[PDB]
Design a protein around this ligand. Structure first.
Ligand SMILES: [Ca+2]
Ligand SMILES: [Ca+2]
Lengths: 127, 127
């Protein structure tokens, strides 16, 4: 529906290339922007499914990084004040996060800058 | 010329998907086949540029894993007897990998089995 689907590879050399290309973009986003990929994944997940309230449960489900790293990312991002969030809410499932409609200017702007670096990197590397 | 080129992504959500998909195939190849990705990269590099004699120099150049991990991979693969390879006492020739003809069949055979797992994986994965 939205966003170009990723084309599947069917042999070793294509896999290797895909990984090489993905690793380069990952390291760049981290180098510049100084942010872990899990923080990146949480941030883009939030941007895709716009909301005011998110269940840390769902986020962890829709991502593939294991709670330890995810919660670790939510935590940091929370301090950076990308979204309030706050732990300790007892019973039910666990934790939830709050995305102030204005902290979203902070996120989508960060993601807009990453989108610009991505197209620049595509023009660059092109190995 | 040979092998489907990897299509570039141009935004965060596509990046994330590409990485998710690449990570799954990587972990599988490692889980099963029990082999590191650098060993995989060396092995597919060898299979792409068929030869009898390889300069560990070139291999390290054409790959993006830093000598430490590459040489570490060459070493193991060498014991596994995928290719002979002989070090030095000095000469700075810093290793020269040799793959006779039988070892080649061993390499291709293995990469051939890795190719079939990728296909089965593309049928399960589907995210
Ligand atoms: Ca192919
Ligand atoms: Ca797009």
């Amino acid at each position: 529906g939205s966003h170009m689907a990723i084309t599947k590879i069917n042999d070793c050399f294509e896999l290797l290339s895909m990984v090489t290309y993905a690793d380069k973009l990952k390291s760049l986003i981290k180098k510049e922007f100084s942010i872990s990929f899990e923080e990146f994944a949480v941030l883009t997940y939030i941007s895709e499914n716009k909301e005011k309230e998110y269940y840390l449960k769902d986020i962890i489900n829709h991502l593939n990084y294991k709670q330890p790293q995810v919660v670790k990312a939510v935590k940091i991002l929370s301090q950076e004040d990308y979204f309030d969030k706050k732990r300790n809410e007892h019973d039910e499932r666990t934790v939830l996060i709050l995305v102030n409609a204005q902290q979203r200017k902070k996120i989508e702007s960060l993601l807009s800058r990453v989108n610009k670096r991505i197209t620049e990197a595509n023009n660059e590397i092109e190995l």
